[model samples]
Target chain A: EDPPACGSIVPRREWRALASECRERLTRPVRYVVVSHTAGSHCDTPASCAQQAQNVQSYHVRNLGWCDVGYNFLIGEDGLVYEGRGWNIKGAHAGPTWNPISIGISFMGNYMNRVPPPRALRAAQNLLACGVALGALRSNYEVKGHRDVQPTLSPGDRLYEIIQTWSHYRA
Target chain B: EDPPACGSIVPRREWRALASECRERLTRPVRYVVVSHTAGSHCDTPASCAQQAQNVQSYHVRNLGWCDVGYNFLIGEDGLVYEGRGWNIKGAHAGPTWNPISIGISFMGNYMNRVPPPRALRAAQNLLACGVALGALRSNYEVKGHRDVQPTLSPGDRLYEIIQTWSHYRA
Candidate 1:
């Protein structure tokens, strides 16, 4: 069967709770939470963005019968978490094999085209720290954009630069 | 309709003829032949390598009906052109929109896995000059590998350094 999509949205507080549960459960739990921009989403406003996300969640959960939204978590333009598929379940993000182990967090909106507000970027970094506490991840789990997987300009020219500037992505 | 798939192998001389025609006909002909490698094929001998290439070509062409191999041209372990789809037609070797205007070339062996054979590297440089003369391409046409397009473990780790040693592509 097809797996859940990766990097979907989750309600911020719910993510906190899920992190707690994951910490309590797995011997080798979730390790890294990657900060990202949708680089794929085209939504412009919070409501439209949230609604678009909700559509993505419902499609995956109801139609695909996934336990939750495809992604383990997402940060919206408002820096709020809308609920998503919790971790422990494998994601459809990344390659199929790489997902179950990855803590797929995504930021809504096509950051490649429009810059994400600082609020969104900050929220994502904070969320990543939270994920580290719950999981047995390496200190240097790779933080990369979709472009890192294959070629196609997403995560945009500007925002991708911002991600690198703030983080140690280079090997 | 789907554009021609790049896995078909035209005869070598015919491939050269097509590149020449493209140069004579197009308003803005291909200017550079960007090289890359899958770095997957690890055959050790020339005959074995050639046989494997034939199989790959058959799979992509007879089975897949691609116009030529994804690359516009290929440098084998033997350091010869195992002609890919005619150079005039758009190649799938380069990223989207790039193949049509850019000449895309690849070496059969994975250059990124290890340095490509010296003969193959030398052949590639000579081939680049041919592309320049046949396409009447400008000097500024960058002779970059696939990594130049995006981050990839291709063209081997040291391929760029080797390519850089050449006067034609030296930075």
Candidate 2:
């Protein structure tokens, strides 16, 4: 009953996600998009990325006790966007303040010492374009590093630096 | 510049909190109050409770990498409320869904096998009264155990059962 058809994006069922029940909504055309890195193992193939997606969801859902995977979308090194809470529902990524207003997208691997492959970065940018076209993100939405709003080393040093140069990024 | 004089409420400075940088705000007259227990040591004296509060803050700040102590306020068996993020600021307790909209007040000790003493319970109830009178929480704000909203067994069985009987409690 929600979300547009994003052909290259992997669906929840396609990744074998566990059941989730999140209720909060991010009113359409949200103004901010938060970019981060999972700080976990990298996956370059569709099969491995799907497994990495499930692993991320497992920790956030089972161990951290959250409603679902925290991010709205995850960018895989395979050059595919993995659906998390998706566009309609609010996610638990970032802190309480940003969580309600931002769509959080994290890369599948830590990027403190290395940058993600160009395809991975493109996947994230493409997802944002998709968000704007679907009226989920504001056309001129601002991008923020996870560290810009929270007290963590997320989206890693390398990834954080790269996002700073992106067209939509603010500071 | 806000908050009424809660005499027994220990201020953050009194506990010697480390430097922190959290900028999120929680709008006043919030609708929910989530109760939880620290699941740590219990303290029955003013001196000891203050130490317990410091320890809790240290873990949340240093180990877990949170902005500050997770709860808005913490209750002690010594019958005092320890100020955390306080009324105006949003806290990291509960999940993202509840953290923004609700005030989280946790007890300083685990409560699975036993209940907090009468004075401790009174301290918590008194804090809620202060919240309502100060126009921080709604006059008819609902109360929820931590487990009611998150997956943890916090505000444990004994204390959870007790909160269920409070006037503001909702299933």
- For lDDT, the strongest prediction is 2
Worst 10 residues of 1 chain B by lDDT: B17-26
Please, what's the RMSD in Å of model 2?
9.9
For model 1 chain A, give the 10-residue run with minimal summed lDDT. Answer: A17-26
Clashes of each: 29, 1
What lDDT is obtained when candidate 1 is compared to the true structure? 0.55
Model 1 residue runs over 4 Å out of place are: A1-171, B1-28, B43-46, B62-65, B167-171
Per-residue lDDT of A1-171 in model 1, one digit per residue for the tens? 133223334453433322321221222455444444444454545566667676655544454344455566667777665555454555444443345456667766666457777777776776665545544445556676544543224456677777777564641
Error of 2 at A37 (Å): 1.3
Q: What lDDT score goes with residue B95 in model 2?
A: 63
Instruction: Count steric clashes of candidate 2.
Output: 1
Q: Which stretches of candidate 2 lie over 4 Å from their true place?
A: A1-6, B1-171
Q: Write the per-residue lDDT of candidate 2 for residues B96-141, one digit (tens) a residue.
A: 6788999999998988898999999999999999888789999999
Q: List the residue pairs that clash in candidate 2.
A: A37-A155
Tens digits of per-residue lDDT, candidate 1, B1-171, equal 433222323365532322222222223455555667744464545556566556555544544344445566677766565666545666655444356567666777655337776777666666666555555355567676565543234565677667666554522
